[PDB]
Design a protein around this ligand. Structure first.
Ligand SMILES: O=c1ccn([C@@H]2O[C@H](COP(=O)(O)OP(=O)(O)O[C@H]3O[C@H](CO)[C@H](O)[C@H](O)[C@H]3O)[C@@H](O)[C@H]2O)c(=O)[nH]1
Ligand SMILES: CCCCCCCCO[C@@H]1O[C@H](CO)[C@H](O)[C@H](N)[C@H]1O[C@@H]1O[C@@H](C)[C@@H](O)[C@@H](O)[C@@H]1O
Ligand SMILES: [Hg+2]
Ligand SMILES: [Hg+2]
Length: 263
C-alpha cells in the first residue's frame, strides 16, 4: 500500500536463476518457497508497512502438552521475529501450558477445548502440529492467501506414489492420473478467510464420509490434499519447512532445516 523506502541490495539477474536444482514456481504461477528465492529484507518491509499480524494455532491435548515449551521457545527465536504474532493454544489442560517468555508485540491465548475472533485479531493464520521445533527462520516469505507445504517423504515422488485417498467412495478421492503435490497436514495457512474456507470444506467432506461409513486413509490430510488440488494454493512451501533429520538426514537440496519433528 504505502511506498517502500530506499533500499540497497543485489540487483536481481534476469539471465541468472536463484535456484537451478529445484522448481521455484508452480504451473499456476505460485512461488515455491526455497532458500535463495527471496530477499527477506524486502519482504519484511512490505509486511511491516501493513502492520501484519500472524496467528499461529496449535492443538495440545493429553500428552502433547509436553511439547509446548520447546515449540513456543523456538517459535520465539525463529517465527515471524519482528512482526506481530498471536499464538492460539487449544488444549484440554489450560493449567499445563508452560509460562514461556515472549518478545514484545507477541501474545499467547489459551483456549480450552468463535472463528469470528480470528477475523478481528489476525491477518493470517498458520496452522501447525505441536510436536515440532523451529530450527531456523520461518517468516513472512510464507504469507499469502493460501499455502500448503510439501510432505518431506514425497517431494521427489511420482503422483502415483502419493498416498492420496484412492477409494472413489470417499470425498477425498483422487485418481492416479491427478495431483500436483502431496501436501502434509502439519503446516498450512493463509488469510483467515481462506483458512476458514478450507477448514469448513474439510469438515463437511469428513462428515459426508462418516455418513457413508468411510474414513480417508490419512484423515484430515487426505481431505487437505483434495482441497488443494481443486483450489490451488497461492504459495507452496518447500520441505525446508517440514523435515525430520533423523529419518531423512540433511540433503544438499535443503540449504536450511527450518521446522522439524521432535524425536
Ligand atoms: O494435541 C495434539 C494431538 C495430535 N497432534 C498431531 O496429530 C498427528 C496424529 O494424529 P491425531 O491428531 O489424530 O492423533 P494421534 O496421535 O492419536 O494419532 C500427530 O502427528 C501430531 O502432530 C497435534 O498436533 N496436537
Ligand atoms: C515433519 C516430519 C515428517 C517426516 C515424515 C515421516 C514419514 C511418515 O510420515 C507420515 O506420512 C503419512 C502420509 O503417507 C501421513 O502424513 C502421516 N501423518 C505421517 O506421519 C508423521 O510422521 C510419522 C513418522 C509420525 O511421527 C507421525 O506421528 C506423524 O504424523
Ligand atoms: Hg488454524
Ligand atoms: Hg483439511
Amino acid at each position: 500500500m504505502v511506498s517502500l523506502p530506499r533500499m540497497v541490495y543485489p540487483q536481481p539477474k534476469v539471465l541468472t536463476p536463484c535456484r537451478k536444482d529445484v522448481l521455484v514456481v508452480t504451473p499456476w504461477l505460485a512461488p515455491i518457497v526455497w532458500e535463495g528465492t527471496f530477499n527477506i529484507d524486502i519482504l519484511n518491509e512490505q509486511f511491516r508497512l501493513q502492520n501484519t499480524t500472524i496467528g499461529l494455532t496449535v492443538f495440545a491435548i493429553k500428552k502433547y502438552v509436553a511439547f509446548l515449551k520447546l515449540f513456543l521457545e523456538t517459535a520465539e527465536k525463529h517465527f515471524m521475529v519482528g512482526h506481530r504474532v498471536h499464538y492460539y493454544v487449544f488444549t484440554d489442560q489450560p493449567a499445563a501450558v508452560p509460562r514461556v517468555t515472549l518478545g514484545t508485540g507477541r501474545q499467547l491465548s489459551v483456549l480450552e477445548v468463535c472463528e469470528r475472533r480470528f477475523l478481528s485479531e489476525v491477518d493470517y493464520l498458520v496452522c501447525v502440529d505441536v510436536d515440532m521445533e523451529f530450527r531456523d527462520h520461518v517468516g513472512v516469505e510464507i504469507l499469502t492467501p493460501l499455502f500448503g507445504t510439501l510432505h518431506p517423504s514425497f517431494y521427489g515422488s511420482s503422483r502415483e506414489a502419493f498416498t492420496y485417498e484412492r477409494r472413489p467412495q470417499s470425498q477425498a478421492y483422487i485418481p492416479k492420473d491427478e495431483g500436483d503435490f502431496y501436501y502434509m497436514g502439519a503446516f498450512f495457512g493463509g488469510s483467515v478467510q481462506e483458512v476458514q474456507r478450507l477448514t469448513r470444506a474439510c469438515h463437511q467432506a469428513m462428515m459426508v464420509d462418516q455418513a457413508n461409513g468411510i474414513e480417508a486413509v490419512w484423515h484430515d490430510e487426505s481431505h487437505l490434499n483434495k482441497y488443494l488440488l481443486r483450489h490451488k494454493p497461492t504459495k507452496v512451501l518447500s520441505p525446508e519447512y517440514l523435515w525430520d533429520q533423523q529419518l531423512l538426514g540433511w540433503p544438499a537440496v535443503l540449504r536450511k532445516l527450518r521446522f522439524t519433528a521432535v524425536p
